[PDB]
């Protein structure tokens, strides 16, 4: 049924974890459909972000996005910060990635920010998942409109990925998160369709703490 097609496409995403050297993406071809021109080897877009909005404060978002272009074999993007719940207060700090190092291309307003960039690791570089069918009490959702679909699982605080996130980020909640897998576009795949995952620590009306990651192969601009 649709649940098995949803699990299958999501398992294909989980399989990328980990890719510890980002340069390996220069030599990885993802799913190709008719939206790619014959001459375009594609671009991998990697995006990791941590969102922390504690009760009664601003929703602070910090993350990075890299465009790993297989045609140029060069990688550019930015580190971003937002304090808004496109984001109307986003500040982007440009970077490049060479030999698996993140290098700012303009000076930073302060050292804390320069060090966060320099030491940055995308969740694809260190995450590692089980087979999707090994996660426990999954709510699988399917909407034919887009179509869009999701798979939601409850994790435990001793889960390897949860521990890695708590090591690398100061996450102000003790709660074990949900693993939320999200996708849209034809189930077989689409260069225009999305795939993302989320570790949802807290989700309510006045407090939101979550981490999002996406690693996607797309046609180059
Ligand atoms: Ca896609």
C-alpha span between 128 and 151 (Å, rounded): 17
**Residue 116, both tokens:** 């966060």
How far is the C-alpha of 214 from the C-alpha of 182, rounded, in Å?
Answer: 10
Q: How far is the CA of 71 from the centre of ligand 1 (A)?
A: 19
Cβ burial of 73 (10 Å; 0-12, 13-18, 19+) is: exposed
Is the separation of the CB atoms in 159 and 134 below 8 Å?
no
Beta strands across the sheet bearing 91-98:
101-104, 91-98, 74-82, 60-69, 43-53, 208-218, 195-203, 178-184, 148-154, 139-143
- How remote is the CA of residue 173 from the centroid of ligand 1, in Å? 32
Distance 218 CA to ligand 1 centre (A): 7
CB burial of residue 106 (10 Å; 0-12, 13-18, 19+):
exposed
Q: If you measure from the C-alpha of residue 190 to the centroid of ligand 1, how many angstroms do you get, rounded to a whole number?
A: 5
- Ion ligand 1: residues, CB < 5 A: 193
CA of 164 to the centre of ligand 1 (A): 26
The helix or strand, by DSSP H or E, that contains position 3, with its residue range, turns out to be: helix 2-14
Are β-strands 208-218 and 43-53 bridged in parallel, bridged antiparallel, or unpaired? antiparallel
Distance from Cα 182 to the centre of ligand 1, integer Å: 11
* Cβ atoms of 195 and 27 closer than 8 Å: no
Q: Token pair of 32, please?
A: 């190709």
Which two tokens mark 173? 């909640």
Tokens 């982007």 -> residue: 92
The CA 9 to ligand 1 mean position distance, Å, reads 10
What's the CA gap between 74 and 51, in Å, rounded? 28
Distance 217 CA to ligand 1 centre (A): 7
Distance from residue 13's CA to the centre of ligand 1 (Å)? 10
Please give the biggest Cα pair distance in the chain.
53
> In angstroms, what is the resolution?
1.9
Six-digit token string for 49: 């972000």
How remote is the CA of residue 112 from the centroid of ligand 1, in Å? 34
Torsion of the alpha carbons at 43, 48, 206 and 86, rounded to the nearest 10: -30
46 contacts 214 by C-beta, under 8 angstroms: yes
**Burial of 110 (C-beta count, 10 Å sphere; 0-12/13-18/19+):** exposed
Domains of the chain: 1-221 (2.50.20.40)
Measured distance CA(89)–CA(76) in Å, rounded: 22
- Say how many Å lie between the CA of residue 56 and the centre of ligand 1: 36
Query: How far is the C-alpha of 7 from the C-alpha of 184, rounded, in Å?
Result: 13
- Beta bridge partners of residue 202, listed in sequence order: 209
CA distance 180 to 132: 11
| Closest CA relative to residue 215, chosen from 66, 39, 54 | 66
This structure was determined by X-ray
> Does residue 127 contact residue 161 with C-beta atoms inside 8 Å?
yes
Distance in angstroms (rounded) separating the CA atoms of residues 27 and 171: 34
Q: What's the CA-to-centroid distance between 36 and ligand 1, angstroms?
A: 12
Distance 186 CA to ligand 1 centre (A): 9
């Amino acid at each position: 049924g649709r649940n098995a097609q949803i699990k299958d496409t999501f398992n294909q995403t989980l399989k990328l974890y980990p890719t510890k050297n980002l340069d390996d993406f220069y030599d990885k071809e993802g799913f190709r459909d008719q939206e790619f021109k014959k001459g375009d080897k594609g671009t991998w877009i990697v995006n990791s972000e941590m969102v922390i909005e504690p009760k009664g404060k601003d929703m602070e978002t910090r993350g990075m996005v890299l465009y790993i272009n297989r045609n140029t074999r060069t990688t550019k993007g930015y580190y971003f910060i937002s304090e808004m719940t496109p984001k109307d207060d986003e500040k982007r700090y440009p970077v490049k990635m060479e030999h698996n190092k993140i290098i700012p291309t303009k000076p930073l307003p302060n050292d804390k920010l320069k060090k966060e960039i320099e030491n940055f690791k995308f969740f694809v570089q260190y995450g590692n998942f089980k087979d999707i069918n090994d996660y426990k009490d999954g709510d699988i959702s399917y909407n034919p409109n887009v179509p869009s679909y999701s798979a939601k699982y409850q994790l435990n605080n001793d889960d390897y990925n949860v521990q890695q996130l708590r090591k690398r980020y100061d996450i102000p909640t003790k709660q074990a998160p949900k693993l939320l897998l999200k996708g849209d576009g034809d189930l077989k795949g689409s260069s225009v369709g999305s795939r993302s995952l989320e570790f949802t620590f807290v989700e309510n009306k006045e407090e939101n703490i979550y981490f999002t990651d996406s690693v996607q192969y797309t046609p180059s601009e």
